[PDB]
Amino acid sequence: ELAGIKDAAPDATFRIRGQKLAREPHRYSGRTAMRANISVHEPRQPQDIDTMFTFSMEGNNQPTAHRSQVPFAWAPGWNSPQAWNKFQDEVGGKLRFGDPGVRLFETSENGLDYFTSVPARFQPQDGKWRIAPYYHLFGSDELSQRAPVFQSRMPQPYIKLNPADAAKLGVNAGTRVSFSYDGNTVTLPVEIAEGLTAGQVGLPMGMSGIAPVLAGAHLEDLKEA
Amino acid sequence: IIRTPETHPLTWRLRDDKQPVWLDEYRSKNGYEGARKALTGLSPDEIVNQVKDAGLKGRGGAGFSTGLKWSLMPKDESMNIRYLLCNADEMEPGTYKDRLLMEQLPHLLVEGMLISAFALKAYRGYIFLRGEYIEAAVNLRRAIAEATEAGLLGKNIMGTGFDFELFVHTGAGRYICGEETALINSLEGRRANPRSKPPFPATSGAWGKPTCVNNVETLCNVPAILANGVEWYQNISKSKDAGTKLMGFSGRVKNPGLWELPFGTTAREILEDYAGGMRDGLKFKAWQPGGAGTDFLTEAHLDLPMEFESIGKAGSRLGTALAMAVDHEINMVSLVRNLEEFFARESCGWCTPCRDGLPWSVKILRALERGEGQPGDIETLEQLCRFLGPGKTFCAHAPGAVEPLQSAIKYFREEFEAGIKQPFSNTHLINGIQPNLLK
Amino acid sequence: AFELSAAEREAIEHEMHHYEDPRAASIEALKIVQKQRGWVPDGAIHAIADVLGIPASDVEGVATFYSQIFRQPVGRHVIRYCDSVVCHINGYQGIQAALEKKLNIKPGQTTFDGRFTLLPTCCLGNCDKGPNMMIDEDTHAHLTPEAIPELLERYK
Amino acid sequence: VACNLCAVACPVGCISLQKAETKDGRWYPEFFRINFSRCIFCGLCEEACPTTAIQLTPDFEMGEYKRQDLVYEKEDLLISGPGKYPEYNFYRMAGMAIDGKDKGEAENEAKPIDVKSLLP
Amino acid sequence: ATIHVDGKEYEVNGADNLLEACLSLGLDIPYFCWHPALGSVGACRQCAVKQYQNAEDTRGRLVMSCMTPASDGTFISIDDEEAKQFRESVVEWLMTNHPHDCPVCEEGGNCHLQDMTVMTGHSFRRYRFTKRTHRNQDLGPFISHEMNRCIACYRCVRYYKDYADGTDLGVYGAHDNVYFGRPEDGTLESEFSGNLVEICPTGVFTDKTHSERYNRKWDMQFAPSI
Ligand SMILES: Cc1cc2nc3c(=O)[nH]c(=O)nc-3n(C[C@H](O)[C@H](O)[C@H](O)COP(=O)(O)O)c2cc1C
Ligand code: SF4
Ligand code: SF4
Ligand code: SF4
Ligand code: SF4
Ligand code: SF4
Ligand code: FES
Ligand code: FES
Ligand SMILES: [Ca+2]
Helix, strand or coil: HHHHHHHHHCCCCCCCCCCCCCCCCCCCCCCCCCCCCCCCCCCCCCCCCCEECCCCCCCCCCCCCCCCCCCCCCEEEECCCHHCCCEEEECCCCCCCCCCCCCCCCCCCCCCCCCCCCCCCCCCCCCCCEEEECCCCCCCCCCHHHHCCCCCCCCCCCCCEEHHHHHHHCCCCEEEEEEEECCEEEEEEEEEEEEEEEEEEEEEECCCCCHHHHHCCEEEEEECC | CCCCCCCCCCCCCCCCCCCCCCHHHHHHHCCCCCCCCHHCCCCCCCHHHHHHHHCEEEEECCEEEHHHCCCCCCCCCCCCCCCCEECCCCCCCCHHHHHHHHHHHHHHHEEEEEEEHHHCCCEEEECCCCCCHHHHHHHHHHHHHHHHHHHEEECCCHCCCEEEEEEEEEECCCCCHHHHHHHHHHHHHHHHHHCCCCCCCCCHHHCCCCCCECHHHHHHHHHHHHHHHHHHHCCCCCCCCCCEEEEEECEECCCCEEEEEEEEECHHHEEEEEEECCCCCCEEEECCCCCCCCCCEEEEHHHCCCCCHHHHHHHCCCCCCCEEEECCCCHHHHHHHHHHHHHHHHHCCCCCCHHHHHHHHHHHHHHEEEEEEECCCHHHHHHHHCCCCCCCCCCHHHHHHHHHHHHHHHHHHHHHHEEEECCCCCCCCCCCCCCCCCC | CCCHHHHHHHHHHHCCCCCHHHHHHHHHHHHHHHHHCCCCCCHHHHHHHHHCCCCCCHHHHHHHHCCCCCCCCCCCCEEEECCHHHHHHHCCHHHHHHHHHHCCCCCCCCCCCEEEEEEEECCCCCCCHHCCEEECEEECCCCCCCCHHHHHHCCC | CCCEEEEECCCCCCCEEEEEEEECCCCCEEEEECCCCCCCCCCCHHHCCCCCCCCCCCCCCCCCHHHHEEECCCCCCCCCCCCCCCCCCCHHHHHCCCEEEEECCCCCECCCCCCCCCCC | EEECCCCCEEEECCCHHHHHHHHHCCCCCCCCEECCCCECCCCCCCCEEEEEECCCCCCCCCEECCCCCCCEEEEEECCCCCCCCCHHHHEEEHHCCCCCCHHCCCCCCCHHHHHHHHCCCCCCCCCCCCCCCCCCCCCCCEEEEEEEHCCCCCHHHHHHHHCCCCCCCCEEEECCCEEEEECCCCCCCCCCCHHHEEEEEEEEEEEHHHCCCCHHHHCCCCCCCC
């Protein structure tokens, strides 16, 4: 099934007229002084036997090179991101020699059949709160939330409640409520979400201490802390 | 000076006490007769053809014929939504005509609205005003309400099944709103940046619908053509440009006013026989034929007919035909500095040459006024004048902006050379670097 | 904090009934707020944006694009004098000097009591009777420098 | 100002530095090292410096015992005076706002006109 | 379609404008305001070429290649003397207010205006008057704002409003006091606000995360990745 990945990128023996592809621009600087604080002896340049790129400027990055992988856009006279116009066959279209990436599967001729599993309508039962997922672009991802720059853009950990459910619980906007899931009692402050359907409660998936697997689960013993 | 209706179709119903003409007085003096004829006996395309072969031209300054512009409307019946706009901005300096027709004769404008909106099949009409004409706004709104309660505005106008609605949109004081595409953009509530052509406003104008933008003077000229006929309108003046026009002189003259004359009247008659000549102790130096956005002309150009072709052959524009006279007591550098400061501070900021070259010429002329000119100054001014003409900029505000500068440079270069006193010094010295002394 | 009045909101709705798009009432809404409060405060942009359904960015751009919409507080009267070409020919400079001598302020500033705010303006359309001045809703023609303090004493 | 023009203009590549910013926003090099065992004293860095910060004094006695001591860090490069150019200041010409220099306070810079100003 | 650039015949797509058709052929035409993903508005007036009516036409007319359709049998010239002078003049007019900030700017070495001034051959300055300045805004922890370095090319407003449908950034001001930014200090609300660091041809919008540990583009070891 994974036979397509052979055509994703050419192997490490791929050369453009005998030479490799450069990683850094040809005017890379400081080559004899980046490592001078450790030792004055110039070390071996790192050898990249895995791929067709090299860890130096001794390579090919011409706009007319027959390849699909471009490390960066640079043309003589075009040092801006507008060098991609020189790196395309036509401006605004595809790359000059085809875009990288290969489809793993084609479209099947015959499709599936109709799924008869029609679910019943949602019934808000007492004492159990269904988890509505509120994803955020900054925070839901496992790796992006660890970025210290994202913490300023990170929203505060907030739990969303219907006005009717908030009135039933007697809680306002901003007050702290505590809920337990899988023997883990955590406390969060409350926003009031008008469009949320009653009997649910809204949680931000991917937060610190809140798993994204909680979507669609039920919440017990939600109460004001 | 008597004003018979045969030779003064626009201003023969004026009142001597500077009071507006209301609905009963307008209808007593043959009012809404062309409106009645056009709505009863004439098809809209017949009225468009009559305006086309009557030789009526636009009075906003472009000189474009209105019949040809009305013929650019789409013939598709699926787009029945249509808009007709009046450029009642009148923000060009030296222009005071539209204030005169639309402060004390609003029913003529209303009748022109009705006739042109029926001919264009326009279901709505707007008058894009300016914020500084309060009395004109009050008179237009009162006349519109009076025409509404008299059955001439609204649904089923005079039993013809044509529904037309008229609105007044008071502007907020920006000169670029006088441009027709920018007028449309300001009508929609956006920043008044103009639009590129093609597409024209006729194909897709206000809110994407077919739209016709016309001056106050042209829409006032229309009901006279519809009432007194077309062959009468062609026989008003024996010139290429037919019909009467509001022309007049202003600025240090005995009688700075405004008159209605047939086309082809030479500029000395409007200066001496009507404005009384220049004032006591002031001799003639120059004159602008169209106001702030035209080329200056000398004494020898005073015996020239005020037509589009004659002034265009002379190297200028007729414009609004409201000439301003400059005596010798006013320095040309100061006057051009004031003109360029107005044009630089009324730029819309869309396209680079006008936006970042008019302030440069402003600073150069301000340095010339105080006598701080440097070598290479007039060269920079004529460089800017060459590279701000038609086609280079997005709209025609910048050609009209650099027209007076190049005209005063061509005709009065000795006054600009007097301000060049300082030697050229762009770079201050740096201790430890020998300068590159260019020869 | 800025809260729109009921009369302001009613006038804005009646104005946006006239156009097919609610964005077209932005200039008239800003002018209505300007007429009611002298100038356009910071929360007025958000209020007009929430009423009209258009974002506050283009409302602020419209309010800053047009010179007759004031985004800074002004005095009880706005004296606008025509600095254009014909009034320069007719000599508006003496009128401006008389105004600066009476008000003791430069153009673009307001008096310390909030009475007058002096501003140059565009062509007022009265070039045949120039020079011309424009206090809040009244224009004046054939101005002389000696008649300026007599003219300005009828505005409290 | 740690603009890295000297490092790229150096044909031997014996310059390394890193840009850092203070609280006010001015730019300085976090570190700065020259490999004098590699430098050919070609003077291209001083020619390419847009602030005239780096200069070549008339001093030649730079012999050394070990090659590790030929790498001159920022402690051995910053001197107490302006060197061969006594009165130049890049921040007087620069358009960026720093401590003690507001917007419009540089050479040939007008005061910032606000978009809310009542003047047309 | 068939075009003739400097007397040389080329075959191009007839629907596209002259700017992208000529940039597809490798010809070098200056441009600021036009973007391949945003369309033509004809703002910067930098893309001027000299179009002739027919083959035996010598006068011509200065048009903008981004708003000129690449119709069949078009005759244009790129390196005409008047066209080159006008393009250098447009660069100079953009240079009358650009601050002396290139050593202390993050877009140095990656600046479209730098490459575009060097490409047009403009190197001599004859502007001796003052330069306008603008106060900056706090545009959140990602985008750093420096309004002095703007050239009013209207790319940011066009992308952020027409393309990304963002509502908190726009253009204000007037004739030469145009201000591109938020109406008040605050974080940019759109989820596609990062593309302003390359949509902007100058260093008005800069990557503040990169601006912390900044180094120039020639010092970057790059790689393609996902
Ligand atoms: C900068 C500029 C300002 C203009 N101002 C006006 C104006 O105030 N009134 C007007 O009728 N036309 C004005 N025009 C001309 C319009 O573009 C257009 O000719 C007019 O709206 C209708 O033309 P018409 O006379 O054929 O009806 C202006 C044009 C430009 C370029
Ligand atoms: S010439 Fe350009 S910047 Fe000037 S007013 Fe017209 S479109 Fe606006
Ligand atoms: S003088 Fe030395 S440090 Fe300077 S550019 Fe030349 S080799 Fe590099
Ligand atoms: S020494 Fe000069 S050239 Fe080198 S980074 Fe500093 S300012 Fe730039
Ligand atoms: S901020 Fe950048 S993208 Fe926006 S108009 Fe200015 S130069 Fe263009
Ligand atoms: S954005 Fe301005 S300061 Fe930065 S490199 Fe470009 S021209 Fe220089
Ligand atoms: S020039 Fe002042 S009123 Fe027209
Ligand atoms: S690229 Fe054509 S005018 Fe901007
Ligand atoms: Ca590897």
